């Protein structure tokens, strides 16, 4: 039968769809995906889900449209879905109930064949192809299946909706109940079964009448593409009876639903309407939070859909994976200069100041969510201030990162207030509820933020940080409402030392202005100091003039290939397929590293001027080393992977013991003595080692490992080079090292 309004005939669709629901297997999906193969040898996926639901009575069947797509002879339906949801959904539910019936007439007992057939069945097709957010939504697709992302602002309280009337038992004494099946409600003039009152005033008992949940959910899409000038848009939503309350305020949900368009009234007295319809989205399915908190539930059966959703994590969350892409990934991971390479691969236009890039990269992979049943909220990510002499790429690095990440929210300082930093709540008097608004920090829930002129920020502001940075929550308490909105977000602030540059006659923690609490709050502080080198200076000048040479300049730095686009998907794979477990050996070297950090910081006059190593130093070391191990796709933290973490934390501090003001205008006498004693000992060994030849490595294990920590061993290279000039020994091939006759 052809449809007068869609010309999409039913019989063929239902017929193909039936054996579609019986021919379905995991493999179709795998072939399109191209991922490595079993799924218990590809059992029938749909009968799996169908049996499970029949036994659980969910009557809701989640479905990824790409699955139905990846099967032969169904793409017709796969597109008609995107084009005729209003009826393909109907025929889908019909087929669902009918295959339930065939299954139960094959499967002896379930619902006695009737309780099943009585209750309806709804389908939940999600992930039909992510549309291009709001500003793309065309009035040409008024009735199509859109996918939208973005957090929700406000949820109207549960609103009932008439479904079946229950009309007043008249003096005739036989109440009558009737549904509506449209926006119309008909009350029969005559009274009840007997026409005791043919003329009658039938009334309605609006308490026993059934109802249906209709929740209106405003939505503010993610600022993935919002160019400038306009605040990210908003698309009101409606939800019908099963996904209701699956989305509280503040959540970061994703939705797949049909677009709609309805006129409005102006006077509301006369029946005349207005052109320029208003629009919303009748949702169909809601990807729950796109998060992994899993503290407690929110709603009814819907959580069963959430459990059916979370298990397929790999392809659905990567949104793209191929072992040619994954092979490229593992290959890159194999490359040795990785930590260097990817560093520059973040901001290729940025010059030699690599350690900044390193810290930034480590921020991108930030930490792992260790969720405790007791305690909890251990700020899974990190936070990086950076400061230094004006005009030193800081602000541009921030721009660069904010562009890199898929969730960044740029923001300035001193042009912003505490409300801007942490959403502000409003008791809406319309429905007397809690709405949240414009959290700059909340927009960045997940993924980094950026903040400039951090010093120039007001003291009235720069106080919400004192909370959000260490608990990732904001506890607002004003006249109407008290609440705590959690905003997990890795801040990344620029700065400017007081005045307009250093004063290497001034203490460092005074040269930075911020108070020590908020300062130690920052996981990692950089001091990008400007030098008068004249050795890098001309290199930098060339590094600018070259980009000015071309018209459309690319790869401003050395011409080494680096994957400007690949690295983003690389990151969004790493942060989600690997969770570093801190092995035992790491624990030791981490503890000793902390102890050494703190004992060094010890002093009597370190109290007022220095930055003291405190427990957050250990938090930094651990949350940062596990991020390093997440990089390189390492599944478990090694021991030689916290060492560079220590190095990075020491980027700021290396050069002062009792008083700050590093100074350190970079061959020392104590270095002379070091080389000299090493020469003594190594000559004594090689003259005691009668087999006069041994490798540099063997010699190192002979001496440099007998006791406490190994030495550079390139200072050993200079030692043996001296012993070549002096000719006390002879390398005699790289494999060994002999002495002189």
């Amino acid at each position: 039968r052809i449809i007068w309004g869609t010309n999409v005939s039913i019989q063929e669709c239902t017929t193909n769809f039936r054996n579609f629901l019986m021919s379905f297997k995991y493999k179709f999906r795998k072939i399109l995906d191209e991922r490595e193969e079993n799924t218990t040898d590809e059992e029938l996926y749909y009968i799996k889900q169908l049996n499970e639901m029949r036994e659980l009575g969910t009557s809701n069947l989640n479905l990824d449209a790409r699955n139905l797509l990846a099967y032969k002879q169904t793409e017709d339906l796969y597109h008609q879905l995107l084009n005729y949801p209003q009826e393909v959904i109907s025929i889908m539910d019909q087929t669902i109930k009918d295959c339930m019936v065939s299954l139960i007439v094959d499967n002896n007992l379930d619902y006695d064949l009737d309780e099943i057939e009585t209750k309806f069945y709804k389908v939940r097709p999600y992930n039909v192809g992510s549309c291009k957010g709001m500003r793309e939504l065309n009035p040409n697709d008024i009735d199509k299946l859109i996918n939208l992302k973005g957090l929700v602002l406000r949820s109207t309280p549960v609103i009932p909706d008439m479904k079946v009337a229950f009309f007043k038992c008249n003096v005739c004494d036989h109440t009558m109940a009737v549904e509506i099946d449209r926006g119309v409600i008909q009350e029969p003039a005559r009274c009840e079964r007997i026409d005791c009152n043919e003329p009658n005033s039938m009334s309605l008992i609006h308490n026993r009448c059934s109802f249906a949940d209709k929740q209106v959910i405003k939505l503010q899409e993610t600022p993935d593409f919002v160019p400038d000038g306009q605040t990210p848009h908003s698309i009101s939503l409606c939800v019908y009876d099963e996904l209701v309350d699956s989305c509280r305020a503040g959540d970061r949900i994703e939705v797949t639903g049909t677009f709609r368009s309805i006129p409005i009234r102006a006077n509301s007295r006369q029946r005349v309407l207005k052109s320029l319809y208003k629009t919303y989205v009748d949702v169909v399915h809601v990807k729950k939070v796109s998060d992994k908190r899993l503290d407690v539930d929110t709603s009814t059966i819907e959580q069963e859909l959430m459990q059916n959703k979370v298990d397929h994590n790999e392809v659905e969350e990567v949104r793209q994976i191929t072992d040619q892409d994954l092979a490229k990934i593992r290959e890159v991971a194999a490359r040795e200069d990785l930590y260097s390479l990817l560093a520059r691969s973040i901001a290729p236009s940025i010059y030699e100041l690599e350690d900044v890039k390193k810290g930034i990269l480590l921020q991108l992979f930030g930490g792992t969510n260790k969720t405790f049943t007791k305690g909890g909220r251990y700020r899974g990510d990190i936070n990086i201030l950076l400061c230094g002499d004006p005009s030193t790429s800081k602000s541009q690095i921030l721009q660069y990162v904010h562009k890199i990440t898929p969730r960044g929210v740029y923001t300035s300082g001193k042009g912003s207030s505490a409300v801007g930093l942490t959403a502000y709540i409003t008791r809406d008097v319309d429905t007397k509820q809690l709405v949240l608004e414009s959290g700059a920090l909340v927009l960045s829930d997940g993924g980094v933020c950026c903040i400039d002129e951090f010093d120039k920020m007001s003291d009235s502001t720069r106080s919400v940080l004192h909370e959000v940075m260490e608990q990732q929550t904001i506890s607002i308490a004003k006249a109407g409402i008290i609440t705590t909105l959690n905003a997990r977000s890795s801040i990344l602030a620029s700065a400017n030392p007081i005045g307009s540059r250093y004063n290497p006659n001034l203490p460092v923690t005074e040269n930075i202005d911020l108070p020590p609490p908020l300062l130690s709050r920052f996981d990692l502080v950089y001091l990008v100091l400007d030098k008068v080198d004249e050795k890098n200076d001309r290199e930098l000048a060339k590094h600018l003039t070259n980009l000015y040479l071309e018209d459309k300049p690319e790869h401003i730095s050395q011409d080494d290939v680096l994957p400007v686009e690949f690295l983003t998907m690389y990151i969004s794979y790493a942060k989600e397929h690997i969770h570093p477990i801190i092995t035992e050996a790491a624990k030791t070297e981490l503890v000793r590293a902390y102890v050494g950090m703190r004992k060094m910081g010890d002093d009597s006059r370190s109290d007022e001027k220095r930055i003291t190593a405190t427990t957050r130093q250990l938090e930094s070391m651990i949350r940062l080393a596990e991020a390093h191990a997440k990089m390189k796709l390492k599944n478990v933290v090694e021991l030689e992977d916290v060492q560079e973490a220590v190095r990075l934390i020491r980027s700021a501090i290396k050069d002062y013991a009792t008083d700050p003001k590093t100074g350190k205008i970079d061959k020392s006498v104590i270095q002379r003595k070091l080389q000299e004693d090493l020469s003594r000992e190594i000559m004594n060994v090689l003259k005691d080692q009668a087999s006069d030849s041994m490798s540099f490595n063997e010699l190192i294990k002979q001496i440099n490992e007998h006791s406490q920590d190994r030495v550079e061993s390139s200072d050993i290279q200079e030692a043996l080079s001296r012993l070549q000039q002096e000719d006390k020994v002879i390398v005699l091939g790289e494999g060994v090292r002999r002495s002189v006759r």
Binding site: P139, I142, D228, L276, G415, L421, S500, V564
Partner: protein, 394 residues
């Protein structure tokens, strides 16, 4: 959806006709008889709403009488038509009611915006005036706020009374039905011929360097720098990476005898789009931007921050010393050009301002401190000078 593009002046050159159609005129120039004429106007777009689907042919299915009835979209105020005129159920005492169906009908994009004057077309008197525009058809989403653009179409008031009272009158609203758009600043004409004249006239560099400020003689060098500023015109959007502001930020230093405020009047009169102000003339939020979260559509309204007005123009500034350094943050923000981000009062968004800043400052000790070194006279913390490109102490 078909549209018309106004002819270039080429045809009026060879065949002079009613050329007023293609002549760009300001909204002030709209005469009472010009209502209905295909008119090209230029200015600045503002408050462009988002795409809204407006119906064109309203359908009505009865579901009982079958006949799909189609009515025409009147002025924005319309009515859902009453009981059907279908003959399937008719000719009896029965008639099945009809109702619309979005799929059965037809829609099309619709947008509004407003236009303001170039600020060099308004007298030294009255306030600039706005003008509605209803963008229709596939021309939607091809626009943006803040672009110099020649828009063309018809000029109509539609009949509708606000209070819907008895007396109607005619509250003459307007709209330029978007028949075509020309977004300038991405000529081979008489202007380019005179340009060739200029390039041939020689010394053009030092020529302009002299003709600039052609009321005052002396201090040629600073006028040279002003020439370099007003020309500007470089940039490096490096692509897949860091943008680089190709604009100029030149600052002065001196005493009233330098007449530098006169130089500023000169330049930002000479520069198109140019704007003048003082250090204390506009507060911080006044100069950068003021946003209102419009409650009607709950949207963002930008109320003319001096800087955003200054986009694609040179901002003249006086008394920059007394600019209340707590306000120096905005300007300091400007060194990082064409990005003014604001995250306050429930709004957290950016607004770009392609601007070059010209400042005028004073030594803190009045005329000058000979006993003290430079940069003492110049109280500006080096994190501001470094953003400047040229400093001219006089």
């Amino acid at each position: 959806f078909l549209y018309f593009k106004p002819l270039s002046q080429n045809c009026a050159r060879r065949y002079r006709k009613k050329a007023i159609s293609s002549k760009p005129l300001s909204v002030r120039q709209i005469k009472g008889d010009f209502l209905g004429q295909l008119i090209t106007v230029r200015g600045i777009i503002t408050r462009v709403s988002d795409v809204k689907p407006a119906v064109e042919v309203i359908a009505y299915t009865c579901d009982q009488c079958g006949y799909e009835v189609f009515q025409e979209v009147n002025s924005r105020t319309f009515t859902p038509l009453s009981e059907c005129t279908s003959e399937e159920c008719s000719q009896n005492q029965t008639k099945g009611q009809l109702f619309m169906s979005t799929r059965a009908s037809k829609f099309s994009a619709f947008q509004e915006c407003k236009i303001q004057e170039l600020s060099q077309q308004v007298p030294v008197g009255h306030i600039p005036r706005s003008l509605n525009i209803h963008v229709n058809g596939t021309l939607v989403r091809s626009l943006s706020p803040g672009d110099i653009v020649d828009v063309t179409g018809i000029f109509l008031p539609a009949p509708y009374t606000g209070f819907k009272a008895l007396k109607a009158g005619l509250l003459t609203e307007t709209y330029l039905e978007a028949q075509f758009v020309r977004q300038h600043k991405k000529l081979t004409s008489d202007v380019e011929e005179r340009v060739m004249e200029l390039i041939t006239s020689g010394d053009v560099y030092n020529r302009l360097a002299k003709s600039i400020a052609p009321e005052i003689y002396g201090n040629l060098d600073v006028k040279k720098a002003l020439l370099l500023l007003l020309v500007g015109g470089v940039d490096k959007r490096v692509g897949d990476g860091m943008k680089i502001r190709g604009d100029i930020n030149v600052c002065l230093m001196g005493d009233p005898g330098v007449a530098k405020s006169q130089l500023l009047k000169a330049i930002c009169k000479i520069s198109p789009r140019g704007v003048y102000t003082t250090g204390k003339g506009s507060s911080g939020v006044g100069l950068t931007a003021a946003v209102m979260k419009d409650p009607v559509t709950d949207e963002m309204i930008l109320e003319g921050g001096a800087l955003v007005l200054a986009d694609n123009g040179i901002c003249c500034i006086d008394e920059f010393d007394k600019m209340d350094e707590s306000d120096r943050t905005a300007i300091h923000e400007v060194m990082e050009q064409q990005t003014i981000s604001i995250s306050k009062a429930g709004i957290n968004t950016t607004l770009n301002a392609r601007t070059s800043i010209l400042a005028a400052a004073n030594p803190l000790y009045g005329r000058y401190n000979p006993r003290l070194s430079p940069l003492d006279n110049i109280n500006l913390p080096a994190a501001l000078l470094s953003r400047f490109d040229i400093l001219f102490l006089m």
